[PDB]
Structure formats: structure tokens, C-alpha cells
Symmetry: C3
Subunit: 356 residues, 3 copies
């Protein structure tokens, strides 16, 4: 039969901490939807405080994959900091490699989040606001050394598309950028991508391809990068290194995945002396929903939540199945149906409130 | 197991009447997709003839909900009438309230429906036309007394967005307006929303926020508000009050709903001396289809149709299961699969033709 | 219970041939999603070499349907040839008929495919490239004799929409053109349709409606008409007539279909001395995915592959169930789950590599 076997774990820190140790694992005997298989991928993300006075974080990521025998790699190292409550800045470098090909880059970017409104009538009356509409502005400057024949070729293609295309370049680049079903997923999350504005495009003197470009993306409220702008970057809680790792193996007969992290932001002040496990980000559910409906499956799942010592759940919906002091478990019944729901694209709230 | 239990009833008036008494009830042990739960909502709609000579209808609606403990209310009272076969006019007032907040409004609007074509080649050859492409133009003037700090604040935000945004205001307002997955649902129904054109925005003298704005929406044929413009407002059949009521209760473990109404338009002349139960509106099926695929379910359903005395079904597909004179019932087999189909987004025709 | 019963067959030619005899049949006891039923349709397509020196193909198609008792017919005869590796030309004629109505047409068109990039870094490292982004330009000149009242009426409507609409005509025509859920399907495949540009619209002297119009369509890589431009027209392999036939019967209780063809392009050089059955086109899967999720179903399927004499499979994923020399069969297990997957919108690769 078709069965999804999964295990999730949440271990929460108490006091003034929002930190949690999270774990996930799943295996399902269904094909992945990728038109090129097998596909294996590993991701690691680390965030460490560089300067707590200026709120500078050193964010490092490494992604390695094998897709239909092609070996890929992305490495990135970036310094991130808020400048204002709406403007964040990033300065970094990295390298992208595919088989016998590689290219290096350096960049500087500013990202400005703009909520469409501010209302005390909403703030006073909605205890847990979810959908928050807005638009977010990117201004990117990037540099790539044109140190091989392939980089020269692609740079020349962009020179032709930018000069030839005119107003069409910034418009038509969107379907090049959002390759395959990444394009389809834009509308799926109530998201919009503006045309690209080219401020600078040129070759510096070996030769270096230089560019400065801008775009905005917007959301009707599902887009967490906009609705939860401050929360998604919990620099104020980063008093030590945080890290997350994920990995999957897939082919036309199965998918297997494991995630483990230790990071701030797992819990949040819910008000009235209560705390919550953070609201589930909506984009992962909505996007995974585009693949989660291709095969009927039974659910064999368990969630384990371990609160800090002397703390207890005050409200849980779906209700936990069993308890032993600070440890709570969810399996079968209502929780298994919620698991099926969210794997298929559902965004139905699973809420956990705790205190003491 | 996961089971959808539902009951539907249709009681038809005969002679020159298109009226029917409709009833629906359903319960399913699945979470709702709302990222904020529990959520309960009740709706009541009434339409009464004010002036049959001018074809003026008094349309009143009241919606009350509780979402994650927040109490909401919408009350609206409107005078509606056709001016031409394409232009309808509406003059009304209402109130929107959320928790400790409330605001009143008055409005005047004109809505012009424009079918993209008229063809006798289509009219002569298609006995039951469904997809009809068109565009529909709204021209709205609205007034809100700015009688609290919140209204002043929001009005000021709109003053900044309208003057600052310029051409961007009418464009970017769409993702603010179609909150969360309402934005996603636009494309889902083959629907389009034009940018908003601001004709007037200002403060009148307490202070009153005044605005006049325009937009058009279009459809490729699924949009019933366009394809079935005259049919959706059966003023010619409104010789007495019509009314409909609906209510639901939902949380992360279940959904329960009941609908009951007595209204014209339930049956329609099918031609050749036959009558049909009206074609199923496509938008409800297509939109509910965005939530109906999150959990596998078994179907426990029944539809009961009661024709007027001495009338009989001449054709039914899916075929009814049983009959007793003017009463017909559908359950199990083909009908249960059609029920599953339409709950998931399917628009497959279920046709009932009757006469005598 | 709900069961999809299907049988597929592939018989491959060897040596320098890419030709294959393909067969498909399926029956499922579910309603079709069409809001007008019953619906039966037959299609026949033939391609024959007219001139191998100029690479001219005579492509003929005939489509006949009955939808809710309305009898329809489309007949087309066209001369197609590549002019360059990016530009193809078509010159043809046909007739569209619905019930008591009919109209004839003649046309000339050029279609220019434009891949967004060319990269040797991609070519050297990706053994089987799938997503290829691009845009494709249509330039159509068409003529219809206005020999009945209906043609005069529609021509007059277009005269009003073109002169009245101005810039709006080319924009709003898209929802008229992509009737019903054809509009929704555009975004679904990561596809874009540009506004129509009208170069010529007029009446010639009986009266003939004349028009010249242009549009482009683009894809993020799922759009096979763009990604696989040369492959979808295998003129170099057309040394004799190729033909395909398909037919379906559907209503609110069932769907039944059969396809049979004999055509080039069924196999392709995979490199390294290996051959593959061609990559599955993504658009059919993605589009059928919009209807394939409305009813849970069990899978009763078989695929039979017959290689040319002395050839063997070197790799198959999902793995074949059984073998007897050059004959291989897939049924149950992993293949049945892949069948369920692709019927619901999944694009997960099923790969067959063979040699000798
Ligand atoms: C298909 C399954 C669903 C899903 C199903 C569930 C379920 C079921 C539960 C949670 C729970 C939680 N999930 Mg979730 N969740 C998804 C994806 C996300 C993402 C994300 C960035 O993608 C985030 C930030 C979260 C966040 C959270 C917290 C709100 C919460 C506690 C952590 C936990 O138990 O994790 C468990 C870890 C996982 C489910 C692993 C998810 C891995 C995702 C799919 C990303 C894999 C990326 C891969 C390794 C690399 C991709 C590389 C690119 C190809 C380049 N989820 C995916 C899409 N999630 C729990 C909760 O609500 O507690 C109150 C809970 O019970
Ligand atoms: C995802 C939705 C939005 C988006 C939302 C945001 C948000 C929100 C932010 C940025 C930020 C930035 N974005 Mg942006 N961004 C988008 C698309 C782009 C594209 C592109 C070509 O598509 C580019 C070039 C950029 C460029 C940039 C840089 C200017 C800057 C830092 C990026 C970086 O370091 O990434 C390197 C990172 C990776 C390669 C992996 C990231 C994987 C995912 C996204 C991580 C989620 C967190 C995970 C669940 C938990 C991590 C825990 C660890 C313990 C830390 N964005 C899309 C349209 N972007 C950030 C910034 O610093 O601005 C100044 C910022 O705050
Ligand atoms: C934000 C995007 C990342 C990036 C991410 C990747 C990834 C991921 C991949 C490549 C790959 C390729 N990249 Mg790179 N690449 C960047 C910058 C560059 C620059 C440059 C001078 O800035 C050049 C010449 C190249 C060149 C190339 C090709 C040689 C190579 C294969 C074709 C292709 O898919 O191109 C894709 C080209 C781009 C993504 C960006 C090109 C930028 C141009 C030249 C200048 C700016 C144009 C405009 C203002 C902004 C465009 C925004 C992007 C569409 C997101 N990249 C930056 C640092 N690039 C692929 C590869 O290795 O294949 C074997 C691959 O998988
Ligand atoms: C999920 C289930 C499907 C659905 C499944 C079925 C089934 C199954 C049957 C019909 C049947 C009919 N339906 Mg239907 N139908 C839906 C929604 C609609 C809507 C609408 C405005 O939403 C309309 C006008 C109709 C109209 C009709 C008639 C064509 C026909 C006879 C009435 C009847 O039996 O009703 C029964 C009543 C219902 C199914 C209740 C539907 C309630 C919908 C979901 C709206 C609830 C709104 C809620 C109370 C308030 C929302 C407030 C906002 C949040 C602010 N349906 C929903 C989306 N319908 C029958 C038929 O074809 O007869 C020939 C039949 O057998
Ligand atoms: C729904 C698809 C279209 C749409 C289609 C139509 C159609 C069609 C008509 C209007 C009408 C109007 N619309 Mg409009 N309209 C849309 C979006 C809007 C928006 C907005 C901010 O989104 C606004 C402000 C308006 C504004 C207006 C007013 C000018 C006018 C009367 C509205 C009213 O009284 O509602 C108060 C009503 C409610 C709060 C509840 C309505 C719930 C649903 C929509 C009712 C369906 C009927 C139900 C199944 C059966 C009822 C039976 C009873 C016995 C009567 N429309 C969307 C884009 N609109 C009507 C008019 O009079 O024009 C002059 C008209 O005929
Ligand atoms: C057609 C839309 C309805 C309407 C429906 C609702 C609903 C439903 C809700 C609110 C809520 C709010 N409304 Mg109101 N509201 C209208 C008219 C107004 C006017 C005005 C002077 O005309 C003002 C100042 C306000 C102000 C406010 C906020 C104080 C409040 C919380 C923020 C928010 O969501 O705003 C939303 C603001 C709007 C929907 C319209 C603002 C119109 C502006 C000021 C003038 C016209 C601008 C432009 C020409 C047209 C915009 C079209 C709309 C986007 C649909 N509304 C009209 C009568 N409003 C929410 C609330 O109570 O939260 C606690 C809430 O749930
Ligand atoms: C719903 C089912 C899926 C589907 C499921 C499968 C399965 C399962 C298998 C293949 C296989 C193959 N399919 Mg497929 N396939 C679909 C549609 C397509 C289309 C197309 C133009 O629509 C093409 C070109 C192909 C091509 C191919 C080859 C890559 C491969 C070998 C041929 C074969 O076995 O065919 C079998 C024939 C069919 C499945 C019939 C498909 C008929 C489609 C739905 C079109 C019917 C049109 C109708 C008659 C007329 C419409 C008229 C309009 C209304 C005007 N498929 C549909 C959408 N296909 C096999 C493979 O991968 O081998 C390695 C395999 O095992
Ligand atoms: C499908 C995605 C694209 C598209 C992709 C392409 C591609 C790719 C090509 C054309 C070609 C042409 N297109 Mg175009 N075209 C689109 C929409 C249109 C529309 C429209 C009103 O929507 C029009 C008027 C045209 C017009 C034209 C003509 C200029 C020309 C020949 C058409 C013809 O003979 O069809 C008559 C055909 C039919 C009525 C049936 C076709 C059914 C499907 C599409 C066939 C698939 C092949 C099947 C799986 C296997 C066949 C095997 C046989 C043994 C041959 N296109 C959409 C947006 N078009 C071709 C050309 O010659 O250009 C110069 C060409 O190469
Ligand atoms: C590429 C499109 C095909 C075509 C495919 C079909 C199909 C399929 C159907 C009709 C049907 C109709 N067609 Mg025809 N039709 C074409 C050309 C024409 C021309 C013309 C002088 O060129 C005229 C006057 C007509 C007229 C008509 C109507 C009398 C009739 C019913 C209304 C309707 O759906 O119209 C649809 C009208 C069109 C599809 C095209 C009209 C073109 C106009 C007059 C001139 C060009 C305008 C602009 C530059 C380009 C528009 C592109 C299209 C939107 C795809 N067609 C060409 C050859 N037509 C329907 C029917 O028989 O109903 C009983 C039907 O099912």
C-alpha cells in the first residue's frame, strides 16, 4: 500500500528564550514529481553573531545535489543586518558549480519590506494576525569574474537580450528565472514578481561581469517573507550559533528526507502570559501542495513536543494523544488527518499554547 | 475513517414559477484550511420587491462570524434594479464591525455587463450554453464617516498610497484587496481583475471619507457573475420575499454546515416543453475545489428532489437511484462519485430535465 | 469501487529509425469535468512527405465531436516546412462546422522559436536536459469567405471591438480565446500568452474577411512546443506516411478512450550508444492534472514495450515487472503508483534506456 511514515520532534528552551531543537524525518513510497530523476540533495544553513552591537549575522549556506547523475553545488557566505525596521542589508560571496563548470560571485543587496497598511483596529482585535499584505523591494549589485568561455558566452547573450529586448528584457526574464514549475508556484502563493529593472550591466577589467538590478515581489498575506519580515530574521535572539541541516533522496519509487536544527524563533510570546509554537509558515505548505496530491497515501506519523521543565500545554488543537509531564505526543486520529491535510496543500491551523 | 455526510433537498414550484425550496447539510471530520481556527459563520440574505413597475428590489444581508475568538459582523441594505439589459444600479448602506471596532458606509454603484460576442450560429446550435466570455465594469461611489482614530489613520494611509503610488496604487491594491488565497482564486476561475481607477478621493465636512472608483473584472466563461448576468438576478420572478440562510462551524478536526432557502431561479425553461434544475454555477465548485482535495474521504450522501404535482423527470444523468411519484432520490454509485467530484473542484454536468 | 483500467503498448523500430507503434486504452467509472455532457470526440492526424528536398510535410487533421447533442467538426489540410532551425512556415485551409453552421478558412503562418539562452556549460554537464525556457512568435494571415448572415454578424462585432477597444482589444481577447478553463491552464504549465497585435483587419471583395495578427507565447520549460521545438516536428525521419488516431466517449458516469499511432520520434539517441523512449511531454501531464484529482481511484494497468530484435533494456526506472526476450511489461507496484502520479498531474520521470 502507499504509506507516508514520518516523525517530528520539538524541544523548547524556557525563560527569555524562543529557541528550539527541531527534527523531522519522512519516507514515502511514491515517485517525486521531478522530470529528471534520481535526485538527492543536502542543505546546511548556519547563522552566527558577528557583531551584536550592529546586529550583524554571519549566514552561511551550502547546498549539494545530484540530479540524473549531474553533481551540483552552491556555497554562500553573507553578512546580514537590519538597518531600520523595514530595511535589511546583505554583503556576501559564493560559488555555483555544475559538473565540470564553476563560477564565483560577490554581491551587495538591500531589501526593503513595505506592509500595505498599519491599523490599531486590527492590532487590538486580532490576537494572532496571519495574512499581512505587502510588497518587498530588492536592489542587488553583483560581480562575477568572466574567467572561462562559458561565462563570456552567457554574458554576451545577456548583452544581446538587454540591448535588443529593451522593455521586453525585464518582462520576459521572469520565465527564464522561475524555471519550470517555479513560475506556476508564484500565483499559487498569492505572490507577484515585478519586471526586473536594470540599473547597470557591463564588463570591468581579468574581465568581471558587473550588474545592478531591482525588482519587487508582493503578497496577499500567504508570502511569509513579507508578512513575517522581522520574525524570519530573529537576530535579537541570536546570542550563539544557530544551525539547520536537511537532506533528501528520491527517485521514481520513493522519497526519504531528514531535517534537524537548533535555532531561535521556534516559540513566540502569544500574549496574556502564554507562549505558542510559531505559526506555521504558509508558503512551504502551499508550494508543497503542488506536489502532495499525486498519490493517495495512508499516514503513519508522530509528533513529540518537549516543553521546558515545569511548563505545560494550556491549549492544543488538534489535541495531543498522550502526555507524560512536559512531553506530549500526537499520532493517529485528528493529528494524522491534519498531517495528510498539510502535505496536500492545506493551511488549517494546528495551534499549541503553553505557559509556566 | 474520513467520511463526508451530506443531505440535499429541492422542492419545486410548478406552472409559471421558477421558485424552489432548497436545503443542504454536511458534516466532515477534516480540518478547514483556514490558518486561523476555530471559525464559525452565519449568513442571511433576503430579497423583497420594493417596486415591481421600476423592478426595484430591497436586498438585505447579514454576516456574523467568530474567527480565533474575534467577533465580526457585516450588515448591508441595498436597493437594486436593472436600468437596461446590461446596466444595473445599486444604492445602499451598511456597517462592518470587528471586536471593539465599527464603521458605517453608504454607496451608489453601477455595474455594466459586457458579453464579448453575440452569435445566432451559437444560439441556434447549442441547446444549453455554458461558457460565455465577457467583462463587467464597476463604478462605485462610497462614503464613510471618519468618526474614530482608526478611520482617520487608514484614510491617511490611503492618502499617502494614492498620492505617492501614482500608477502603482491601482495596480498593487489588488493583492491588498484579494487577501490571502482570494488572490490565488482569481486565476483559478479563469477570472481577471483590472487595476483600480481612482476618480475621486477626499475628505468632506464630522469628517467623511469620500471616494469614487472603477474596475472591471472579466471571465473566460466560468465566471457566473458575467456568463449568467440576467439569470443571477431573477427580479421578474420576485412577486414575494425570497430568503436564504447558511451557517458553518469549523475547527482543526471538523466542518459542519447547513443551508436553507426559498427563492426563484431554482428551475429554468430548457426548451421543447422541458424544464431543468438550473445549471450548476461553476465558480463555487472551482473555488471550493481549492480546499476540497486536502483529505481523502468516503461519501455518505442523499439528494431528494420533489417535483410539483403531476410532473415527472424525463431525463436524469447521473440517474436517480429511487422514485415514488414526484419524489426522486440520489445516493451511492454514480451520484456519490459525482458528489466526490464536485467537492474536489470538478464541474461535470449533473442534469435533471422534467415536464408535465 | 472506482477503478482506472488501462493498457499501453510501444513497438519500436531499430537501426537508424526513431519510429514506434504506440497504443493506449483506458476506461474509468468517473464523470468527466465538462459542464456539458455527454461528450464524444474522435481525432485523426496524418503527416506525409510532400517534398523531402525542401522538407515539406502534408499535415492533415480531422476532429469530430458531439457535446450535449451538438455535432461539431474541424477539418484542416496544411503544408509545413522548416525555413531555418528557428523559423517554420505553414500554408493551409480547413473548415469548422457546428450543427447547421459552417465556415471555411485559408491561412499562411510563420512560427519563430526563440530559446532564452544557449550554454555549453549546460550542454556538457546535463545528459538529458528537460526545462528549456523560451518564447515563440506567431505571425498569422487568415481568410474566411463571409458567405452567411452569422459570419457577417461576427465580422461586424470584431470591427466594433477592434476600433472601439483600441489597446484593450489585444489584451481582453485572451479570455475570449482561452474559453473556460483553457485560460486557467495557461499559468498551470508555466506558460504566458502575449496580447494580440492586429496588423490587418478588413473585408475583401463574395465578401471575404481578411486578417493578419501576431502573438507570442512563452514557457519556463514545461511548454514542450518551445522546449522541444525541433523534436516535435521530426521531418528528417518522415520517409513515409505517419498517422495517429484517438477517440473518447464520456458522460457523468464514465470516460473511455483509445489511441493508436505509427510515427517517428518514439525513441531518441540518449548518447553513449544508448537509446531512450522519448522524454514524456510535460504539458499533457500538467493539463490533465487539472482534471485527474476529482475522484479517488484504484489502478489496473499494464504497459508493454517491444524492442527491435536483439535489443535489450539497459536501465528502467520504475523497473519492469516481467520480461521475455525483447518484450517487457510493467504492472502493479511502483509502475501503478507512477500511473496514478502522472494521471493526477505528476511529472516524475519514468525512464527506459535500451541498446544493441
Ligand atoms: C510536506 C510536509 C510539510 C510540513 C509538515 C509539518 C508537520 C506535519 C508538522 C510540522 C511542524 C512544524 N513545521 Mg512544517 N512542514 C513543511 C515545511 C516547513 C518549513 C519549510 C521552510 O519548508 C518550515 C519553516 C516549517 C516549520 C514548522 C514549525 C511551524 C513546526 C515545528 C517544526 C517541525 O516539527 O518540523 C518538522 C520537519 C519537517 C516536516 C520537515 C519539512 C522539510 C521541508 C519539506 C523542506 C525540505 C527541504 C530539503 C531538505 C532541501 C530543499 C533544497 C532545494 C531543492 C534547493 N515547516 C513541509 C512542506 N510541519 C509541526 C507542528 O505544527 O508543530 C506545532 C508538525 O506537526
Ligand atoms: C524567498 C522569497 C523572496 C525573497 C525574500 C527575501 C528575504 C525575506 C530576505 C532576502 C534576502 C536577500 N535576498 Mg531575496 N528573496 C527572493 C529572491 C531573491 C533572488 C533571486 C535571484 O531570486 C536574489 C538574488 C535575492 C537576493 C537577496 C540578497 C540581497 C539577500 C540575502 C540572500 C542570501 O544571503 O541568500 C543565501 C541563502 C540561501 C542560499 C538559502 C536560503 C534558504 C531559505 C530561503 C532559508 C529559510 C530559513 C530556514 C527555514 C531556517 C534557517 C535557520 C538557520 C539557523 C539560519 N533574493 C524571493 C522573491 N530575500 C535577505 C537579506 O538579507 O536582505 C538584505 C532577507 O532578509
Ligand atoms: C542571482 C543569480 C546568480 C547565479 C546563479 C546561477 C545558477 C544557480 C546557475 C547559474 C548558471 C550559469 N550562470 Mg550564473 N548566476 C549569477 C551570475 C552570473 C553572471 C554574471 C556576470 O553576473 C554570469 C555571466 C553567469 C553565467 C552563467 C552561465 C555560464 C551558467 C549556465 C547558463 C545559465 O543558466 O545561466 C543562468 C544565469 C543567471 C542565473 C544570471 C546571469 C546574470 C546576467 C549575466 C547579468 C544580470 C542580468 C539581469 C540584470 C539580472 C538577472 C537575474 C537572474 C535572472 C536571477 N551567471 C548570480 C551570482 N547561475 C547555471 C549553471 O551552472 O549551469 C551549468 C546554474 O545552474
Ligand atoms: C462543497 C459542495 C459544493 C456543492 C455541491 C452540491 C451537490 C452535491 C449538489 C448541489 C446541488 C445544487 N447546488 Mg451546489 N455546491 C456548492 C455550492 C453552490 C452554490 C454557492 C453559491 O456556493 C450554489 C448557488 C449552488 C447551487 C446548487 C443548485 C444548482 C443545486 C440545487 C441546490 C442544492 O441542492 O443545494 C444544496 C446545498 C449545498 C451543497 C450547500 C453549499 C454551501 C456552499 C458551500 C456555500 C456555503 C457558504 C457559507 C454558509 C457562508 C460563507 C460566508 C463567507 C465566508 C463570508 N451550489 C458547494 C461548493 N450542490 C444539487 C444538484 O446538482 O441538484 C441538481 C446537488 O446534488
Ligand atoms: C462576485 C464577482 C464580482 C462581482 C459581481 C457582481 C454582480 C453580478 C453584481 C454586483 C453588484 C454590485 N457590486 Mg460587485 N462583484 C465583485 C466585487 C465587488 C466589490 C469588491 C470590493 O470586491 C464591491 C465593493 C462591489 C460592489 C457592488 C455594488 C455596486 C453592487 C451591489 C453589491 C451589494 O449589494 O452587495 C451586498 C451583498 C452581500 C454582502 C452578499 C452577497 C453574497 C453573494 C455574492 C450572493 C450570491 C447569491 C446567493 C447564491 C443567493 C441569494 C438569494 C437571496 C434570496 C437573494 N462588487 C466581484 C469582482 N457585483 C450587483 C448590483 O446590484 O450591481 C448594480 C450585481 O448585480
Ligand atoms: C468596499 C470596501 C468597504 C470596506 C470593507 C471593510 C472590511 C470588510 C474591513 C474593513 C476594515 C477597515 N476599514 Mg473599511 N471598507 C470600506 C471603506 C473604508 C474607508 C473609507 C473612507 O471609505 C475607510 C477609511 C475604511 C477603514 C478601515 C480600517 C479602519 C479598518 C482596518 C484596516 C483595513 O483592513 O482597512 C481595509 C480598508 C478597506 C477595505 C477600504 C478603504 C477605502 C479607502 C480609504 C478609500 C478608497 C480607496 C480606493 C479608491 C478603493 C479601494 C477598494 C478596496 C481595496 C476594496 N474603510 C468600504 C465601505 N473595511 C477591517 C476591519 O474592520 O478591521 C478591524 C475589515 O475587516
Ligand atoms: C491521463 C494519462 C496521461 C498519460 C499517461 C501515460 C502512461 C501511464 C504512459 C504513457 C506513456 C507515454 N506517453 Mg503519455 N499520457 C498522457 C498524454 C500524452 C501525450 C499527449 C499529446 O497528450 C503524449 C504525446 C504522450 C506521450 C507518451 C510517450 C512519452 C510514452 C509512450 C506512448 C504511450 O504509451 O502512450 C499511451 C497512450 C496514452 C496514455 C493515451 C493518452 C491520450 C491523451 C490523454 C490525449 C487524448 C486526446 C483525445 C483522444 C482527443 C482530444 C481532442 C480535443 C478535445 C479537441 N502522452 C495523458 C495526459 N503516458 C508510457 C511511457 O511512459 O512509456 C515509457 C506510459 O507508461
Ligand atoms: C500548442 C502550443 C502553442 C502553439 C504551438 C505551435 C507549434 C509548436 C507549431 C505551431 C504551428 C502553427 N500554429 Mg501555433 N500554437 C498555439 C496556438 C495557435 C493558434 C490559436 C488560435 O490558438 C493558432 C491559430 C495557431 C496557428 C499556427 C499555424 C501558423 C501553424 C500550423 C497549425 C496547424 O496546422 O494546426 C493544425 C493542427 C491541428 C488542428 C491538430 C494539432 C493537435 C496537436 C497540437 C498535435 C500534437 C502532435 C501529436 C501529439 C502527434 C501527431 C503525429 C502525427 C503522426 C503527425 N497556433 C499555442 C499557443 N503552433 C506549427 C507550424 O507549422 O508553424 C509554422 C508548429 O510547428
Ligand atoms: C484561428 C481561429 C479560426 C476559427 C475558429 C473557430 C472555431 C473553433 C469556432 C468558430 C466559430 C465562429 N466563428 Mg470562426 N475561426 C476563424 C475565423 C473566423 C472569421 C474570420 C473572418 O476570420 C469569422 C468572421 C469567424 C466567425 C465565427 C462565428 C460566426 C462563429 C460563432 C462565434 C464564435 O465563437 O466566433 C469565434 C471567432 C473566432 C475564433 C475568430 C474570429 C476572427 C476575427 C473575425 C478576425 C481576426 C480577429 C483578431 C485579429 C484575431 C483573433 C484570434 C482568435 C481569438 C483565436 N471566424 C479562424 C479560421 N471559429 C464557432 C462556431 O462555429 O460556433 C457555432 C466555433 O466553435
Amino acid at each position: 500500500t502507499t504509506t507516508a511514515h514520518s516523525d517530528y520532534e520539538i524541544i523548547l528552551e524556557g525563560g527569555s528564550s524562543s529557541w528550539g531543537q527541531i527534527k523531522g524525518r519522512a519516507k514515502v513510497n511514491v515517485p517525486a514529481a521531478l522530470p529528471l530523476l534520481p535526485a538527492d540533495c543536502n542543505i546546511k544553513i548556519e547563522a552566527k553573531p558577528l557583531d551584536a552591537q550592529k546586529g550583524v549575522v554571519r549566514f552561511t549556506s551550502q547546498i549539494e545535489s545530484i540530479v540524473d547523475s549531474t553533481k551540483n553545488k552552491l556555497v554562500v557566505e553573507v553578512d546580514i543586518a537590519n538597518e531600520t525596521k523595514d530595511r535589511r542589508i546583505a554583503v556576501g560571496e559564493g560559488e555555483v558549480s555544475v559538473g565540470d563548470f564553476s563560477h564565483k560571485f560577490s554581491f551587495e543587496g538591500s531589501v526593503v519590506n513595505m506592509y500595505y497598511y498599519r491599523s490599531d483596529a486590527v492590532r487590538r482585535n486580532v490576537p494572532n494576525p496571519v495574512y499581512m499584505q505587502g510588497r518587498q523591494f530588492h536592489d542587488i549589485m553583483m560581480k562575477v569574474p568572466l574567467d572561462n568561455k562559458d561565462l563570456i558566452e552567457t554574458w554576451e547573450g545577456f548583452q544581446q537580450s538587454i540591448s535588443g529586448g529593451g522593455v521586453n528584457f525585464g518582462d520576459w526574464i521572469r520565465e527564464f528565472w522561475f524555471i519550470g514549475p517555479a513560475y506556476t508556484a508564484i500565483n499559487e502563493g498569492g505572490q507577484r514578481i515585478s519586471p526586473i529593472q536594470v540599473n547597470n550591466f557591463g564588463v570591468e577589467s581579468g574581465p568581471v561581469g558587473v550588474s545592478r538590478w531591482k525588482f519587487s515581489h508582493a503578497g496577499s498575506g500567504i508570502v511569509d517573507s513579507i508578512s513575517r519580515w522581522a520574525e524570519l530574521f530573529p537576530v535579537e535572539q541570536l546570542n550563539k550559533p544557530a544551525s539547520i541541516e536537511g537532506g533528501f533522496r528520491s527517485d521514481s519509487q520513493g522519497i526519504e528526507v531528514k531535517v534537524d536544527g537548533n535555532l531561535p524563533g521556534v516559540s513566540r510570546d502569544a500574549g496574556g502570559g502564554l507562549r505558542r509554537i510559531l505559526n506555521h509558515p504558509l508558503i512551504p505548505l502551499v508550494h508543497h501542495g503542488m506536489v502532495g496530491k499525486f498519490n493517495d497515501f495512508t499516514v503513519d506519523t508522530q509528533l513529540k513536543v518537549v516543553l521546558p521543565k515545569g511548563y505545560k500545554i494550556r491549549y492544543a488543537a488538534p489535541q495531543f494523544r498522550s502526555q507524560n509531564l512536559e512531553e506530549y505526543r500526537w499520532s493517529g486520529g485528528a493529528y494524522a488527518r491534519w498531517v495528510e491535510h498539510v502535505c496536500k496543500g492545506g493551511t488549517g491551523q494546528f495551534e499549541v499554547l503553553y505557559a509556566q
